[PDB]
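stuck on this fold:
=====
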Amino acid sequence: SWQSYVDNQICQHVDCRLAVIAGLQDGAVWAKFEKDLPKQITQQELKTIADAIRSNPNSFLEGGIHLGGEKYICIQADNSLVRGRKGSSALCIVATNTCLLAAATVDGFPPGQLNNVVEKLGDYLKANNY
C-alpha cells in the first residue's frame, strides 16, 4: 500500500516528523504519517508545493515551504528536488513522474540520511513509471 511505503520505506529508515505521498497534479494525499504537527497536512499545502516544483521552483525562496502548518526555509530547489530546514529539522521533497514525496525529520536527524532515503524511494517509484 502507499501507506506501507511511508511507514516502512521512509519512516523506519529515518525518524519522521512527517512523511507524505501525494499526487503531483492535484495534491491528493495517497499516504501520510505525522508526529506532533501544529496542523494536519492539507491538499492545499501539497498542491501549492506541486505547482511550484512543476512551474517555478524559485517561488520557494519567497515565504518558504509550508507543510503541517510550519514554514521551512528553502536550501535547494529545482523541478525534481526541494530541500528545506526549520531549525534543526530537515525537509526533503521529490517529484516523481506522478507523485510528490515529502518527508521531514525530527530535530537533529542528519539531513543526508533523510535525503538518501527519500531520493531512493523516488528512484524506485520512477523506475516503475510512478
The beta strands are 16-23, 29-34, 65-67, 70-77, 81-86, 89-95, 99-105. The first helix runs from residue 2 to 10. The longest strand covers residues 16-23. The chain has one domain: 2-125.
